[PDB]
Design a protein around this ligand. Structure first.
Ligand code: HEC
Ligand code: HEC
Ligand code: HEC
Ligand code: HEC
Ligand code: HEC
Ligand code: HEC
Ligand code: HEC
Ligand code: HEC
Ligand code: HEC
Ligand code: HEC
Ligand code: HEC
Ligand code: HEC
Ligand code: HEC
Ligand code: HEC
Ligand SMILES: O=S([O-])[O-]
Ligand SMILES: O=S([O-])[O-]
Ligand SMILES: O=S([O-])[O-]
Ligand SMILES: O=S([O-])[O-]
Ligand SMILES: O=S([O-])[O-]
Ligand SMILES: O=S([O-])[O-]
Ligand SMILES: [Ca+2]
Ligand SMILES: [Ca+2]
Lengths: 519, 519, 105, 102
């Protein structure tokens, strides 16, 4: 049984916590629910920590008083097919292996499944840790509650004695680095300085041994990623996002200065030894568009290369942790602004970007976003009860499972079948264009070896490589983006037609050059 | 937003609350969640209350941190048919009107429905307040969440200017009195002395004007009826039950001294002006058999008559608030011990008991009770979740709705259809014997007017009236008890055969006497 | 509300329509259900149209007396996937783009 | 939950079968290019020996009807072996074709 501590004692030194805790909806929630600070209080001074207090980061710390939200969060959607590879003819990107050759995603890239599994799936995917980590057996893949209790309760490490990244099975890669973990867990929130910069008070940083870092982490999607534990108010904690919105002053809605001011973010900084250490972004409103944008965005979280001279950009560089915060038509400019690309294509040699799940940036400017709709309206709606206290469902999943609450309350003119038919019209149309974009990209890629062996000039090949960058960008954005065009159907259509145009231009250029060499 | 108060200051005077609160699982829950004591603290001494602090009795006070339990509690079971009269050929007691003639239940006696409605249903039934209270319109009958928010949010009073019990419609009765409300709400828990005795510190007592009392009450089945708000530990608050178990020393299981010691109750008394005022019974274990027995028992909550001399026993008498705490075979002796009967039959003139829902006393000695099964195992089972934090369902309803959790976890040899078939075999057999018991009782009742008109002696009529008491007791117990035999099938069988035996004896007696008068 | 016209007037010039209309199952269906020919009748000659009569081509012109057939016709089968491209691996022609290159499809 | 466990295995194994086929097809398509570039029989026979293994460690799993469920660890090891052999063959042939071009 918990015994309360006297918070007044803590508040003498922790004035920012005092201002947040005493005013918010957790004013009555005693520190002992999440902190064991007995030895800390005995040894601390106003500027020196003394013994470090223990802080609970497990989701059960919140489930004690918020069981409904916790239980809704941990539910596993069995209809979300697990470990389903995107590079197959029946999934999102039938020609993915040809198009992505040269990148670590060639080793494995599956469709997402329920949030409970995010940390374990990160640890076990073939592209991340060389196959070092596995579920204890193949039964554990179902255990959402187990994963939530902790990754290391359901996983095993092939070699606890070494901490280097290496391959344990031949067709794996070692793409994981510490920045990845910021979108899988915030168990490290007190051990990681803003952006993962080197810092005396940080145990972990961008340059840490990621296998050692991994072993220290346990819980997926901590509740406090969106809710400040002290004020209970809405926030983000993701450094990349705070950096884009606040430090670079781009705003929460970069296309809408008025909405950015009404639905803004305030950066709050915490210090260690009176030096800035970590930060959070307090939200003006409970805006799920910004909360989900902590992870559902295009980012850099990896080493890469400079566009200018081709030199390596390593994890030590700030660009290795970067939110572009740009939609598809602004992305090339944003990548040029930091002088960065992700990989060279194995066949064409083109410098190329690597795009990942840009849901937040795609949603901007769409009909729903312009009408004030947010991610939670469709993916975490309020529960409808004939008799009961309403709460917000935290089972973040497709609106197909709850169309009444997600769509039909707003769209009263439609039955569920009509709303599903509208979704399918958009996804079917967009998927047809993604398949055509891949066809043309693959046709261009296949000409590069023919051109090289025909003696086509480097000048012509470099022209085709510049077109490859654009053809790739305007295609990959849409295979990476999870709604298959629904979040912004007009933009998908315009982008995919641009991809095909660039590929066709490249095919024409190479065919002419090959034919001139033949004559 | 709530602001915490200094609980240590309260404890300078409230030592019993200190002992409970600081030790239990609510040690971190601040008083401000349930008490507004600002002016109280400014004016109180250890010997004088000063300003009375406000105490919240609404269920939302607990739902803030225990939403899952509250939502399961308030759910309305639409399959529990509402306002369904038991005195109809298709319900529990087809001949009820003939058999109960002379009692207030002849005006209306419906089947129970969901707990959310218990207080509103008490106020609107035709037997209780002369038809004074109604739902605001006939649509409100569905509004469980509204009833829980408060009775007077969904009901109207035909005459807010008068406080007397009277008929507003011809075929109603005014049977309600303050004792009834103890099984419908505990909004009065700080305003009612133990047993409803007169007390200087009690606003309300057994002799209060029930219409005035009614207007002060709002919430059904408060959560603290089973859970102490200070320690969060299991308890009962119902004075009639604490009186039977503790004051009369009967024990929690009167047929099992060992179980009574292991699963016992400790009376805790609270004083006003240094005189005993109210009490609660803290339970050794979370024993739902005793928690549900606060209301699901046979009781006196009404005026009646003495068996010895027939004189009136009024609401002022302690016997007007009494738990017999006796099974069907011990009841007659238990009523003789307090010298009490309920009504005289309108046709036969017999002194008769009135029995009400004796589930707790029926359950004793049954195969399930003897095997350590309790009400909650069948009616409040733990929720089964593929992934989630388990909690106890508070939707207290038939196990037919949740057979996997209520029966089939224990009875692994059975399918759901087989378990339902076993229930129906018992209920069909029992209902058959109830109907035969009614047939024979009705036959006996119809002979009384014939015997009186034939000039049969009072001595013979009085022997038949004695038999009527027993025939009635051993039948009505089973129409009152809600499981239709399931809770104790062998006992139901023995009792109902006893009823039929007694009625047959009386029929023989009266037919012989009538025939002797004719000859 | 429709007002019937005298079809005998039309039949003087429209002998093929007469032979078809008077014999079939629409013999009792007046021309006004589908034609507004007031100014036409005033201006036509046996060989010159004069003012062109209006002819309704909307399906509601038939739905007035044949609601069952009309309602069955307009039902949308939501199970018939809309805008589903045939040139994809999960549809009718996985290699369609290669095979049809040069054509508008 | 049991169906979800089956599907995790079959989905993972099918993803590796598709990748094994991609790499086998990439190797097969280089053979005509190598032949017409004048690559030596010695190099082609090396690639043919690798084809035997790449084929075996792929085809076993398209032939086997459980899509990996009957032995998921073995499927995984075999399919990764298939891809390794194909990649070795692709590298061998691409180098040889490029040497003929130079
Ligand atoms: C002054 C004597 C202090 C009192 C009293 C308390 N804390 Fe403290 N704490 C203090 C310092 C100087 C630091 C280092 C950070 C800084 O602000 O300079 C801390 C740190 C914490 C932390 C962070 C621990 C980590 O892992 O980084 C927590 C969670 C914390 N303190 C909590 C806390 C609580 C609950 C207290 C009351 C019981 C409390 N502190 C007292 C200084 C002082
Ligand atoms: C019980 C001791 C609690 C623990 C542990 C946590 N929370 Fe809480 N929370 C609690 C109360 C009594 C309230 C007020 C409810 C009300 O409506 O008055 C809250 C409120 C929240 C809210 C709503 C805040 C708002 O501004 O609307 C959120 C988002 C919330 N709490 C989240 C939360 C999280 C993430 C926790 C774990 C770190 C957590 N709470 C612990 C009671 C308790
Ligand atoms: C980083 C900490 C994240 C935040 C904040 C949110 N999401 Fe997420 N999401 C994330 C990952 C890593 C995954 C895949 C997990 C895996 O193990 O595969 C997801 C998945 C989803 C899904 C798919 C769920 C399914 O049933 O397949 C949806 C619909 C989703 N995410 C939506 C979503 C919304 C609406 C958010 C804000 C409320 C949100 N996510 C936050 C990472 C993170
Ligand atoms: C009893 C006769 C069994 C039947 C029928 C099935 N399973 Fe099983 N399974 C069984 C045992 C004793 C074990 C090993 C358990 C352990 O923890 O040591 C298993 C294992 C599995 C696994 C994990 C396999 C792995 O390689 O790690 C899965 C995914 C599994 N079982 C699923 C499963 C399904 C879907 C079945 C019906 C088709 C099934 N099992 C049958 C025992 C028995
Ligand atoms: C936040 C900006 C993220 C960073 C940094 C990383 N990932 Fe991620 N990941 C993220 C989201 C929002 C989702 C779900 C949506 C989706 O498109 O899949 C994911 C998903 C995964 C998955 C599951 C699906 C899969 O690709 O197999 C894995 C295995 C995964 N992510 C691994 C991973 C690695 C190894 C990272 C660093 C190189 C990494 N992620 C970064 C959000 C974020
Ligand atoms: C961001 C991706 C979230 C994570 C992680 C968690 N919650 Fe949440 N929560 C989120 C949103 C968008 C909302 C609704 C805000 C609105 O006003 O529309 C909520 C709401 C809550 C509340 C308030 C009560 C309610 O509306 O249900 C509570 C108590 C709350 N959330 C708790 C909670 C817990 C315990 C979590 C970890 C399991 C959790 N949230 C995660 C967004 C996010
Ligand atoms: C309703 C108007 C929506 C808003 C606002 C957002 N999304 Fe969405 N999303 C929507 C649909 C109809 C779909 C397709 C679902 C289907 O079953 O066909 C999606 C898809 C996603 C996914 C993939 C989910 C899955 O495949 O299981 C993710 C990860 C997702 N959406 C995330 C997301 C985020 C982060 C949003 C705010 C920026 C967002 N969505 C808004 C409907 C709606
Ligand atoms: C949040 C501010 C709370 C309010 C208001 C109430 N309760 Fe509570 N309760 C709370 C916590 C944090 C815990 C402990 C959870 C744990 O398992 O550690 C509890 C516990 C209970 C229990 C369980 C007690 C036990 O001994 O097992 C019960 C039965 C309980 N609470 C009931 C309850 C009732 C009836 C309330 C209204 C009067 C109520 N609680 C308020 C948090 C909060
Ligand atoms: C719109 C044309 C209506 C149709 C069709 C039905 N109802 Fe109705 N009902 C309607 C109104 C405007 C009112 C009065 C509302 C008010 O608050 O003043 C009602 C009333 C009822 C009631 C209460 C009756 C009473 O005597 O108090 C009930 C129980 C009710 N309605 C139910 C009901 C059912 C079951 C219907 C389908 C058979 C139905 N109504 C049709 C408006 C309309
Ligand atoms: C606790 C010992 C009780 C006292 C005192 C009163 N009632 Fe009751 N009542 C009780 C239970 C456990 C039930 C449900 C089981 C059942 O057999 O019905 C009830 C039910 C009612 C109902 C609804 C059913 C009906 O009979 O119409 C009403 C209207 C009701 N009770 C009214 C009532 C009145 C007027 C009382 C004082 C004379 C009274 N009850 C006392 C438990 C208890
Ligand atoms: C007696 C008729 C009860 C009333 C009224 C309420 N609850 Fe209850 N509760 C009851 C039992 C028999 C149990 C389980 C005890 C056991 O250990 O088996 C519970 C349990 C709780 C808990 C504990 C967590 C859990 O097991 O779910 C909580 C937090 C709790 N109950 C809360 C609660 C609230 C908020 C109520 C009013 C809506 C409430 N209970 C009423 C019995 C009774
Ligand atoms: C399982 C072994 C049970 C235990 C222990 C208790 N009861 Fe029960 N009850 C049980 C059944 C199978 C039935 C019949 C349900 C049906 O749908 O046929 C009942 C009935 C009730 C009822 C009437 C419920 C209704 O008709 O909707 C009440 C009010 C009831 N039981 C209360 C009750 C109490 C208070 C108990 C502990 C003393 C108790 N029951 C034990 C199964 C079981
Ligand atoms: C002779 C004086 C006519 C009378 C009386 C009517 N119509 Fe006629 N119509 C007439 C001519 C010479 C033509 C041109 C075609 C031809 O047969 O030479 C027409 C044309 C029509 C059409 C076709 C209009 C079109 O868009 O092409 C219709 C639908 C038509 N006429 C109908 C019609 C009706 C309903 C009349 C009676 C009310 C009628 N016509 C009288 C000649 C004459
Ligand atoms: C009402 C004024 C009508 C309008 C307008 C139309 N039709 Fe009709 N149709 C009508 C009647 C009274 C009948 C006879 C029904 C019978 O069975 O006796 C018909 C018949 C048809 C048929 C059946 C013809 C056959 O030979 O079996 C068809 C195919 C038909 N009608 C079609 C039709 C169309 C396409 C119309 C719009 C241009 C239309 N009718 C108008 C009454 C009326
Ligand atoms: O209150 S915090 O800034 O220590
Ligand atoms: O690899 S994560 O970004 O999907
Ligand atoms: O603590 S109480 O008994 O005043
Ligand atoms: O002050 S008390 O002890 O009467
Ligand atoms: O009247 S109550 O006891 O059913
Ligand atoms: O009748 S038609 O030919 O004008
Ligand atoms: Ca990227
Ligand atoms: Ca009684």
């Amino acid at each position: 049984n918990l015994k309360p501590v006297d918070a007044m004692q803590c508040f003498d030194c922790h004035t920012q916590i005092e201002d947040m805790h005493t005013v918010g909806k957790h004013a009555t929630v005693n520190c002992v629910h999440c902190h064991d600070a007995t030895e800390h209080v005995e040894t601390a001074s106003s500027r020196r920590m003394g013994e470090r207090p223990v802080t609970r980061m497990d989701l059960e710390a919140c489930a004690t008083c918020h069981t409904a939200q916790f239980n809704s969060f941990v539910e596993v959607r069995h209809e979300s097919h697990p470990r389903l590879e995107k590079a197959t003819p029946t999934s999102r990107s039938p020609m993915f292996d040809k198009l992505i050759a040269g990148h670590g995603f060639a080793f494995e890239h599956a469709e997402p499944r329920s949030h409970a599994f995010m940390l374990v799936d990160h640890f076990v995917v073939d592209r991340a840790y060389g196959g070092r980590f596995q579920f204890k057996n193949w039964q554990k893949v179902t255990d959402g509650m187990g994963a939530v209790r902790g990754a290391w309760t359901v996983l095993t490490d092939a070699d606890p004695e070494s901490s280097d990244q290496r391959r344990f099975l031949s067709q794996t890669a070692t793409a994981a680095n510490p920045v990845c973990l910021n979108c899988k867990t915030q168990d490290h929130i007190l051990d990681w300085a803003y952006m993962g910069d080197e810092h005396e008070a940080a145990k972990w940083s961008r340059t840490s041994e990621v296998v050692e870092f991994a072993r220290d982490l346990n819980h997926p999607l901590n509740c406090f990623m969106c809710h400040d534990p002290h004020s209970a108010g809405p926030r983000v904690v993701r450094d990349g996002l705070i950096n884009a919105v606040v430090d670079r002053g781009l705003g929460t809605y970069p296309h809408d200065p008025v909405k950015s001011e009404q639905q803004g973010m305030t950066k709050v900084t915490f210090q260690r030894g009176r030096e800035d250490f970590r930060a959070i972004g307090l939200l003006d409103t409970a805006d799920s568009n910004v909360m989900c944008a902590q992870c559902h965005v295009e980012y850099n979280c990896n080493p890469g290369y400079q566009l200018s001279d081709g030199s390596r950009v390593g994890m030590d560089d700030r660009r290795a942790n970067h939110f572009f915060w740009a939609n598809v038509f602004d992305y090339k400019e944003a990548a040029q602004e930091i002088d960065f690309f992700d990989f060279r294509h194995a066949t064409t040699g083109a410098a190329l970007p690597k795009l990942q799940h840009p849901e937040a940036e795609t949603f901007w400017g769409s009909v729903h976003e312009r009408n004030g709709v947010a991610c939670a309206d469709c993916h975490m709606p309020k529960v409808q009860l004939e008799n009961g206290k309403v709460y917000t469902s935290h089972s973040q999943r497709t609106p197909r499972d709850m169309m009444g609450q997600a769509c039909l309350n707003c769209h009263a003119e439609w039955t569920e079948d009509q709303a599903l038919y509208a979704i399918d019209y958009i996804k079917n149309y967009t998927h047809g264009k993604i398949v055509k974009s891949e066809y043309w990209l693959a046709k261009m890629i296949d000409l590069f070896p023919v051109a090289k062996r025909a003696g086509v000039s480097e000048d012509v090949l470099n022209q085709a490589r510049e077109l490859h960058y654009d053809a790739h960008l305007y295609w990959e954005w849409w295979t990476a983006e999870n709604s298959v065009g629904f979040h912004n159907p007009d933009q998908a259509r315009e982008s995919l037609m641009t991809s095909i145009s660039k590929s066709k231009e490249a095919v024409s250029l190479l065919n002419d050059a090959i034919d001139a060499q033949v004559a």
